[PDB]
Amino acid sequence: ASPFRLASAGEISEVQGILRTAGLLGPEKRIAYLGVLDPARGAGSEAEDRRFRVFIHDVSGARPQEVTVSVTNGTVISAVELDTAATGELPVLEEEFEVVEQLLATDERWLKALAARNLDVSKVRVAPLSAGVFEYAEERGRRILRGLAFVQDFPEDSAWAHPVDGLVAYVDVVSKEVTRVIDTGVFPVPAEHGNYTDPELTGPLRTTQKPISITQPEGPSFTVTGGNHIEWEKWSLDVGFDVREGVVLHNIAFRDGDRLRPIINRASIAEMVVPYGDPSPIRSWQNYFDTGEYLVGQYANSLELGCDCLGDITYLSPVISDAFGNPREIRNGICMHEEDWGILAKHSDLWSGINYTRRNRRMVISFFTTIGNYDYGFYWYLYLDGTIEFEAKATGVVFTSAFPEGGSDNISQLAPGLGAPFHQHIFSARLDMAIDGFTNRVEEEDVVRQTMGPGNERGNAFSRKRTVLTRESEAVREADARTGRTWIISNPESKNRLNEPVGYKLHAHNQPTLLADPGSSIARRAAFATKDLWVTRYADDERYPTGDFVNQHSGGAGLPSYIAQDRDIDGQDIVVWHTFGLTHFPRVEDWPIMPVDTVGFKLRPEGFFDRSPVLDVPAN
Amino acid sequence: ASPFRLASAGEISEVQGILRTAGLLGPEKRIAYLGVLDPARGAGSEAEDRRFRVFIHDVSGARPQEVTVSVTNGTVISAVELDTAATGELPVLEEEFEVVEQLLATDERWLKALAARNLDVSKVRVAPLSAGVFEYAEERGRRILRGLAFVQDFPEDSAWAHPVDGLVAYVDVVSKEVTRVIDTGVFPVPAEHGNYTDPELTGPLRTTQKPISITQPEGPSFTVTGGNHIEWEKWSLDVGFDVREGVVLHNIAFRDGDRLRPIINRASIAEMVVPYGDPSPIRSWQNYFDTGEYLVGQYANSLELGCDCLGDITYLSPVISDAFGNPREIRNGICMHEEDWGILAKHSDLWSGINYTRRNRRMVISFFTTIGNYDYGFYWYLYLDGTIEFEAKATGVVFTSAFPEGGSDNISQLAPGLGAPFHQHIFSARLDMAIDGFTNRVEEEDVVRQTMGPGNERGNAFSRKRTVLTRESEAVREADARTGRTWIISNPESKNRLNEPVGYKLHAHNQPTLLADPGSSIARRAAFATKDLWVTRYADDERYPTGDFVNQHSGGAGLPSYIAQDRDIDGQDIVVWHTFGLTHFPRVEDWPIMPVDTVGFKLRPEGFFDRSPVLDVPAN
Ligand SMILES: [NH3+]CCc1ccccc1
Ligand SMILES: [NH3+]CCc1ccccc1
Ligand SMILES: [Cu+2]
Ligand SMILES: [Cu+2]
Ligand code: NA
Ligand code: NA
């Protein structure tokens, strides 16, 4: 029934038919993105129109197309040809991953470089890396991937332990041409293996871990109806899934007494970027937008009971399209479960004699994705007390290089001869805000120190100040941990019982933002990553902080172009974009497989309720 | 056997006998602190000497004494009389809590103030608050508590909902004199109750929560021997307990292969301070050092199975002394258990075909304390991957006032007429460091941004810089979240297999430090709280960042006096003192009982191991 339901296999099959019949899905076509569109603002008509957006690539060199299709009315609504020199290339196709290795394998320049290093071409893996935009004019308008080589000693060897440094190639994957092969010198290929399942490396496995059993004898406290609608402990929401963004949360609301109160209309991680800080020409171009260039949702793992998700797990199996329009299920791609979260509130009172303890719990919605060497878990948490939290868990294998004899200011040594270049992992959360409805505003809250003097005779006073952001041109904000800076999203037309506007406070981790020089190509293409907080006026077509076509776009699209409209955001339908990230100086302990590190943010009620909303929780 | 064992009831009984026989425990004496001393540096003699430190108060007005006693040799080792005008008063006694209310209850000035407000004296509770040091010369050398009044409507009423503002009294608790009664005006006593167990307030309790069952069918993975020695997943440590500091961790070590490697010699929360930012004369003096003035360990809760600690719990019941030297057990005062902690490492490799997932877990050691309106949980976490984390959980009831008509810049409104003054909760962790032994140094690590130019042609490079702290006068450091500032404790004489010094990295939360004016009394008494990180050379008598006698000390003792020695700390026996805290602007949701908020820090291995130390963890 719900217009926010997950796309079904049948809907995917209808899209493929419509595209085929219209002539848009010939044997040289490939679907590079397919996703359902959100209902437009004003869905109070109940005239459901399930519409899908499709990016269509042409392997013969014709111009790609962007196509909108209505599965409700079996019709192509629009179909535009794209000038990719202008608006950017389409996302990397999964079938292009192996094309870089196969093309290089017959190139005389490539074979010459491998032969000088005594490497058998059949043992050499090539990572298919996004190209970015730099100085090479011949790349404008062409579909380019760059290749870095790793040696596999045998089919089960971890190739990441054996980078082939001093060597890179650029490949045109449509015309099937190797445009450049750059060989800046020979580096020893690091010899040690990094096979973390080899008993010679692991040693004897521990026998000291006793099992932990988490069970729910009466089942879980949450209900799922309509495939993806969740109700849990006064929370209500719909779990969506998009092949680009991954898990998306719709219509987050809280049942406060008899009233369903909206909080967030749409929550997603709308982009991520991994910039590398090694100035070597072999890698100085290296930045991948896992979300925008590769699409993190299509690489979601199938999560196993007991290993990936522990406890009483309910699964969702979202359906996406393959490159030919066939539906494919990602079996067990989303885990959801509730977890005990310690003490929620506690007090033993000396005067009343009452002893009081209540336990907290959280609802967890998660998925895990793998793009090459990296693996990321995306976790959304809902807490009993109204807190919303996102957490990203970064693991997998670090991207490696040779460690130069004499050392490096931009690379960490992990093993003899083996290095790991410095890099960041930067995320963008897009929070389409709906605090008690759509009339919202953002205030920046700073702690205010006060001087000893009249009115503050003992020099103990301190205060806080709030600054309303009224127009987009002033809503590009930086963190300030020193002054405890946070941001409050409030509804000036909805007041609590003390006649103050209801609100939610955003708590950031205050990690460094983009480190690259502001004049760099990456600073232009990932402009969102240079600031901690952006607020825009909602608009249907303003979906991603980097724009619709990230791959090989020259920069400026997305957030910096949106905010130039300088729209009113004081009590309006607004969207908060929060940049947050990890700066990763790899350590020996990250090798040969990385223990999880984490980053995220949270939102807490700020005068949203009239008192603590967990007074009605029972005693265990 | 172990010299780090918990004090036993028998040891306490021997101390009382020794003190009695020596004439130091007459009927006018009260023990205000009793605790075991740590072994001196160089315990490699196995000549165990269990020594105890005792603070002895005199209710008749004689000078208090500091006394060291050897239970091993049944002897008083030293006994000094204290000049409290000089070195500070002794900690607040539990039996003094009710003395402030009883003294005021017969004072004509006090009764006059209550009568003008139509308050029955039998309904008025008085909070016994530490006095600090301000302008009142008559307080120097005297034992003063200050009193703020709250109305209890009936014996089970929460008095915190009914503050009596505009009124404060100062009391001399030895001479039993009310020195001043200040009445700055009448404020309406807020009428609404805050009884969070009243069904009229809670409404019907939820019936939607299904049970979560956490069990360990084969028992826990950790072993406890000798009463308090823990072994878990290569970790080894002793859990101590001190009536001032609470849980103390001794001899934290990690079994790396065949070698037991030290990491931290002693870890504790050595002080906490709660400064208030309301400039009203009724409260502008208000700062309590829960640890130094009240002793958080003696107010530890008895933790209940299933409510406070959930799962397979092992308890410790530490023994302290009451005011007369009798032992008293704190039944179930310390909980320890292991917890599942999600994914530890995960990778699915496109080239080798290997899918790999391992789960994390943590060892938890915790206690909970209650001092008046506030309740705090102290949590130490040990993780499989070598991470050590501390977390403080703040809950209980916020300290209240009237909300002034017209509003306030320093007070939040929680209910009609009811306010909650702004304040901070600031902790000091004392980490007696022992990274692979006692030769340690601290480096400050900042991210380094680099400019586009020669050697950095694409403007993508970034780096890091480390600054060694060599002398105490340069080891007073501030946070800098913008530059990702962290601190590394390393051993320059112990190298990993890459010939780099082994180390641990301290990750701070970068919350604001002390906000008070640097010229205030609290800035002088809580000087440690004005900076994020201090490093000192280890010394036996340098135990607390505020000094031994915090109550009514005029300031300067502790850290600022220690570092003035300007001792060498470059490859020496050093102690790291980390300040961290919460700045609390109370919200409506904090009322009438606060949901838990948290703050803390963590330490992660930084080239301490030669590879990931969790390669030998088995698959669930
Ligand atoms: N994260 C996308 C970059 C990438 C893609 C494939 C292999 C290695 C790296
Ligand atoms: N936290 C120590 C201050 C305090 C002590 C007793 C009652 C209320 C407040
Ligand atoms: Cu990384
Ligand atoms: Cu507080
Ligand atoms: Na909005
Ligand atoms: Na030390």
One-letter-per-residue 3-state SS of A483-546: HCCEEEEEEEEEECCCCCEEEEEEEECCCCCCCCCCCCHHHHHCHHHHCCEEEEECCCCCCCCC
State whether B610 and A588 contact (CB < 8 Å): yes
Distance CA B292, CA B297 (A): 11
Mark whether A241 and A311 lie in a shared domain.
Answer: yes
Contacts of B415 in chain A (CB under 8 A): 498, 611
In this structure, what DSSP letter does residue B493 have? E
Closest CB from A212, A339, A517 relative to B459 = A517
Q: Chain A residues with CB inside 8 Å of B351's CB?
A: 125, 150, 152, 159
| A37 and A103 housed in the same domain | no
What amino acid occupies position A374? Y
For the CA atoms of A175, A177, A180, A182, what is the dihedral angle to 10 degrees? 130
Q: Both tokens of residue B537?
A: 């050379």
Going by alpha carbons, the residue nearest to atom 3 of ligand 1 is A129
Query: B584: annotated binding-site residue?
Result: yes
At residue B54, the 3 state secondary structure works out as: strand
- The DSSP secondary-structure symbol of B3 reads T
Rounded to whole angstroms, how far apart are CA atoms B606 and B503?
A: 5
DSSP string, B67-92: EEEETTTTEEEEEEE--HHHH-PPPP
A191 plus A205 within the same structural domain: no
User: Tokens at residue B410, please?
Assistant: 């320093």
Q: Which of B37, B40, B30 is nearest to B64 (CA)?
A: B30
Inter-residue contact B342 to B360 (CB < 8 Å):
yes
Token pair for A383: 């807490």
Backbone angles phi, psi at B10, to 5 degrees: -60, -40
Give the number of C-alpha atoms closer than 13 A to the C-alpha of residue B530, restricted to the C-beta side.
17
Question: How many Cβ atoms from other residues are within 10 Å of residue B20's Cβ?
Answer: 14
Q: What is the dihedral of CA B245, B548, B571, B433, to 10 degrees?
A: 0
List helix spans (H) across B311-453: none
Are B232 and B252 contacting, i.e. CB atoms less than 8 angstroms apart? no
Tokens read off for A464: 């806080």
Q: Which helix (H) or strand (E) covers residue B149, if one does?
A: strand B144-151
Q: Which of A92, A94, A173, A371 to mutate to test the pocket of ligand 1 (most atoms within 8 A of CB)?
A: A371
Nearest chain B alpha carbon to A612: B589
**What gap in Å lies between CA B417 and CA B405, rounded to an integer?**
8
Backbone angles phi, psi at A85, to 5 degrees: -60, -30
Whether the ω angle into residue B501 lies within 30 degrees of 0, i.e. cis, is no
State how far the Cα of A521 lies from the Cα of B554, in Å rounded to an integer: 58
**Tokens at residue B354, please?**
């290997």
B287 and B160 housed in the same domain: no
- Annotated binding-site ranges of A for substrate: 288-299, 371-376
Structure token pair of residue A540: 């249907």
> In this structure, what are the phi and psi dihedrals at residue B572, rounded to the nearest 5 degrees?
-135, 180
SS3 at position B233: coil
| Minimum Cα–Cα distance from B204: chain A residue | A616
Report the DSSP beta bridge partners of residue B382. Answer: B363, B388
Contact A583, B447 (CB under 8 A): yes
Q: How far is CA A405 from CA A172, A288, B306, B499, B601, in A?
A: 34, 28, 57, 14, 36
**Tokens describing residue B108:** 């004509």
Q: Which of A540, A507, A592, A609 is nearest to A157 (CA)?
A: A592
User: Pick from B126, B120, B123: which is nearest to B104 by CA?
Assistant: B126
* A263 CA from centroid of ligand 5 (Å): 10
> Are B62 and B136 members of one domain?
no
The residue type of A449 is R
Who's near B521: CB < 8 A, 6+ residues apart? A458, A459, B132, B133, B134, B555
What method was applied to determine this entry?
X-ray
**Helix, strand, coil % (nearest 5) of chain A?**
15, 40, 45
How are strands ordered across the β-sheet holding B177-183? B124-130, B144-151, B167-172, B177-183
* Largest separation between any pair of C-alpha atoms in chain A: 87
Report the C-alpha gap between A123 and A105 in whole angstroms: 11
Helix %, strand %, coil % of chain B (to 5): 15, 40, 45
Tokens of B532: 């994020």
Spatial distance between the Cα atoms of B102 and B128, rounded to a whole number of angstroms: 11
The answer to whether the beta carbons of residues B221 and B337 sit under 8 Å apart is no
Task: Report how far apart, in Å, the C-alpha atoms of A559 and of each of A477, A566, A570 are.
Answer: 13, 12, 18
**CA dist., res. A80 & res. A551, Å (int):** 18
**Which residue is listed with tokens 């209650």?**
B370
Buried/exposed code over A509-521 (b: 16+ C-beta within 10 A; e: otherwise) = bbbbbbbbbeebb
In DSSP terms, which residues pair with B572 in a beta bridge?
Answer: B440
CATH of the domain at A148: 3.10.450.40
For residues A112 and A220, state if they share a domain: no
Tell me the C-alpha to C-alpha distance, in Å, between residue B393 and each of A103, A257, A343, A551, B156: 58, 28, 9, 45, 26
Kindly give the residue spans of alpha helices, DSSP state H, lying in B99-185: 99-104, 108-116
**Where among B161, B195, B229 does a domain terminate?**
B195
Best residue among B146, B374, B398 to mutate for probing ligand 2, ranked by most atoms within 8 Å of CB: B374
Is A290 close to ligand 1, i.e. is its CB under 6 Å away? yes
Query: CA torsion angle for B192, B194, B195, B199 (degrees, to 10)?
Result: 70
Would you tell me how many other CB atoms lie within 10 Å of the CB of residue B184? 12
Query: A437 CB contacts (<8 Å, ≥6 apart)?
Result: A262, A491, A493, A494
Contact A607 B588 (CB under 8 A): yes
**How far is it, in rounded angstroms, from Cα A311 to Cα A306?**
7
Instruction: Tell me which DSSP letter residue B161 carries.
Output: G
Please state, in angstroms and as integers, the Cα–Cα distance from residue B540 to each residue in A225, A381, B536, following that order: 64, 46, 12
- Give just the sign of the alpha carbon dihedral B376, B382, B385, B388: positive
Instruction: Compute the Cα dihedral for B472, B474, B479, B481 and give only its sign.
Output: negative
Which ligand lies nearest to the CA atom of residue B96 in the structure? 2
Cβ-Cβ contacts under 8 Å for B46 (sequence gap 6 or more): none
In contact, B221 and A208? CB cutoff 8 Å: yes
Beta-strand pair B594-605/B501-508: antiparallel
Cα separation, B599 vs B14, whole angstroms: 40
Instruction: State in Å, rounded, how far the first CA of chain A is from the last one.
Output: 37
Buried b (16+ CB within 10 A) or exposed e, A459-481: bbbbbbeeeebeebeebbbebbb
Alpha-carbon distance A514 to B437, whole Å?
38
Residue B41, CA distances (Å) to B50, B228, B538, B539, B575 in order? 14, 21, 10, 9, 14
Q: CB of A135 within 8 A of CB of A128?
A: no
Q: What are phi and psi of A96, to 5 degrees?
A: -80, -10
What CATH code is carried by the domain that includes residue A286?
Answer: 2.70.98.20
On whether the CB atoms of residues B419 and B408 are closer than 8 A, the answer is yes
Whether the CA torsion A361, A365, A370, A374 is positive or negative: it is negative
Handedness of CA B437, B440, B444, B450 (dihedral sign): negative
Residues of B tagged active-site: 290, 374
Ligand showing the shortest atom-to-Cα distance for residue B394: 4
Question: What is the spatial distance between Cα A612 and Cα A174, in angstroms, rounded to a whole number?
Answer: 60
B113: amino acid identity, one letter: A
- Judgement on whether residues B56 and B101 belong to the same structural domain of the protein: no
Domain hosting A381: range is: 196-619
Token output for A259: 């009233």
Tokens of A542: 């303003």
Closest protein CA for atom 9 of ligand 2: B372
Amino acid at A187: F
Name residue, tokens 């500032």.
B485
Contact B196 A356 (CB under 8 A): yes
Q: Are residues A428 and A539 in the same domain?
A: yes
Report CA-CA distances (Å) from B352 to A41, A197, A377, B47, B83: 47, 12, 21, 58, 74
Q: Which residue has the tokens 């603002």?
A: A41
Closest ligand (CA of A291): 1
What are the angstrom distances between the C-alpha of B217 and each of A212, B213, B214, B311? Answer: 8, 12, 10, 11
Long-range pairs, A541-547, Cβ under 8 A, ≥24: A542/A575, A543/A270, A543/A430, A544/A270, A544/A271, A544/A292, A544/A430, A545/A270, A545/A271, A545/A428, A545/A430, A545/A577, A546/A271, A546/A289, A546/A292, A547/A87, A547/A88
The structural domain count of chain B equals 3
DSSP state, residue A568: B
What stretch of H or E contains B232?
strand B229-232
- Beta carbons within 10 angstroms of residue B401's beta carbon: 27
| Residue B345 exposure: Cα atoms within 13 Å on the Cβ side | 25
Among the options A33, A170, A276, A374, which is catalytic? A374
What kind and span of H or E run contains B369? Answer: strand B355-371
Question: Angle CA(A188)–CA(A193)–CA(A194) in degrees, nearest 5?
Answer: 120
How far does Cα A224 stand from its chain's mean position?
Answer: 25
Burial tier of B470 (Cβ tally within 10 Å: 0-12, 13-18, 19+): middle
d(CA A512, CA A251): 31
Structure-block tokens of residue B409: 């810049």
Q: Which residues of B490-502 are buried (b: 16+ CB within 10 A; e: fewer)?
A: bbeebebeeeebb
* Integer Cα distance of A74 and A86 in angstroms: 31
Spatial contact of B190 and B417, defined as CB atoms under 8 Å apart: yes
Q: How far is the CA of A575 from the centre of ligand 5 (A)?
A: 5
Residue B293, SS3?
Answer: helix
Contact A378, A367 (CB under 8 A): yes
Burial class (CB in 10 A: 0-12, 13-18, 19+), A44: exposed
3-state SS class at A373: coil
Strand-pair category, A144-151 with A167-172: antiparallel
- Which of B172, B195, B218 marks a domain boundary? B195
Quote the tokens at residue B469: 């702290």
**To 10 degrees, the CA torsion angle through B563, B565, B566, B570?**
-90
- A129: enclosing H helix or E strand: strand A124-130
Q: How far is A157 from chain B (nearest CA, A)?
A: 6
CB B345 within 8 A of CB A595: yes
CA B58 to each of CA A108, B21, B79, B113: distance values in angstroms, whole numbers, following the listed order = 94, 17, 14, 32
Residues 6+ apart with CB under 8 A from B64: B32, B55, B56, B57, B58, B81, B82, B84, B90
Rounded Cα gap, residues B149 and B127, in angstroms: 6
CA distances from A413 to A400, A419, B24, B249, B499 (A): 10, 4, 62, 33, 11
Contacts for A26 with CB less than 8 Å, ≥ 6 apart: none
Residue B378's beta-bridge partner residues? Answer: B367, B392
3-state class (DSSP) for residue A467: strand
Q: What is the CA radius of gyration of chain A?
A: 26
* Rounded Cα–Cα distance for residues B576 and B538 (Å): 9
What is d(CA A221, CA A255) in angstroms, rounded to the nearest whole number?
Answer: 15
Among B26, B59, B87, residue at a domain's last position:
B87
Structure tokens at B25: 């425990």
Q: Same domain, yes or no, for A502 and A603?
A: yes
Written as six digits, the tokens of B442 are 């601290």
For residues B379 and B397, state if they share a domain: yes
Neighbour tally for A204: CB within 10 Å: 7
Same domain for A148 and A20:
no
Please give the angle made by the CA atoms of B402, B404 and B405, to the nearest 5 degrees. 135
Q: State whether residue B529 is helix, strand or coil.
A: helix
Q: Is A315 a catalytic residue?
A: no
Closest chain A C-alpha to B45 CA, distance in angstroms: 33
| Among chain B residues, CA nearest to A367 | B343
Binding residues of A: 288-299, 371-376, 423, 425, 584
Query: Helix or strand or coil: residue B251?
Result: strand
For residues A67 and A200, state if they share a domain: no
B315 is in an annotated binding site: no
Active site residue A383: no
Cβ atoms A549, A88 nearer than 8 A:
yes
| Kind and range of the H or E run holding A214 | strand A213-215
Residue of chain B with shortest Cα separation from A153: B352
**How many contacts does A have with B, using Cβ atoms within 8 A?**
437
